[PDB]
Symmetry: C3
Subunit: 131 residues, 3 copies
């Protein structure tokens, strides 16, 4: 049940990000949420995560898609859920049917539960397979 | 439990489509099932969906794969990413495209099976 | 429906694949072979490990379909070269598995190889 719940969490989360719902995407993080886009320092809090998303977005006629695969879960000692997933970024250009691909990434997530049973992302660290 | 069942539903459904089992694929729709390949009039009923698939360029040298990702269910309405792969004989690297959004409406069958009332596909490059 | 398999088993298979492929792609060839009981043709874990023996590969899976449990999945291999952001793709494969979670056999066919 937990595995399907995390996949569903990721499904809604990524569709917000790719739909330019940067505030909704940040809302899936804890309020002290930690996000490292690349090995620039990590962004902190939802407002910080939102700012980082806008800035890396200005470079983008463009429709981005963040595909996930092979999510692997494990329980930490503090009740947190460690998640590691593959991610492949698609960049779709207007009137060009073939997307261009890259980067291929590893997504290191720390998930938490809480009083109301809902999951939230404490931290996300993204590494690039070509780096 | 429903989320895993929908992923399972898509796994069998897409493998039918990619295996050129167009009638089996249409059988995953309701009787009045509706399919819209792009914003082209939409096909109606199993025969209409099957006919549309038969008509639409390719088996001696082409193998297609319709990958799904990030299924999100809501209220059953389903939206998933889709990426089409075109594999050519003796060519290891597939051709990619289009990248699509799959807007689905899921309902409960009489046998208790899942079925698609409607499927609307949009293309990310349009 | 009455012939459907439990949904918990389906998620368990996806999780099984998630841990399994990450070991393989991390060049943990013994850990990957440890997910077999098994034939791959190579036989037993020691034979599988030996056969497996700059570049970072990723084996993506999709559309797992279950039916001993017979499993068939799509697989797409990514080859990522150092300092090159766009991966190289291929082959696209079908993964035929028999689950008892552990594998006796994995039969991989290539979509670009026609009869």
């Amino acid at each position: 049940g937990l595995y399907a719940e995390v996949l569903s969490f990721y499904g809604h989360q990524m569709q917000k990000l790719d739909g330019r719902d940067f505030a909704g995407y940040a809302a899936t993080f804890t309020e002290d949420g930690e996000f490292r886009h690349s090995p620039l320092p990590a962004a902190h809090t939802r407002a910080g995560i939102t700012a980082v998303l806008e800035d890396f977005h200005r470079k983008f006629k463009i429709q981005r898609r963040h595909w996930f695969d092979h999510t692997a879960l494990s329980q930490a000692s503090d009740g947190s859920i460690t998640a590691t997933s593959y991610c492949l970024v698609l960049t779709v250009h207007a009137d060009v049917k073939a997307p261009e691909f890259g980067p291929s990434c590893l997504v290191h997530d720390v998930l938490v539960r809480g009083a109301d049973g809902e999951l939230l992302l404490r931290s996300r660290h993204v590494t690039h397979d070509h780096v």
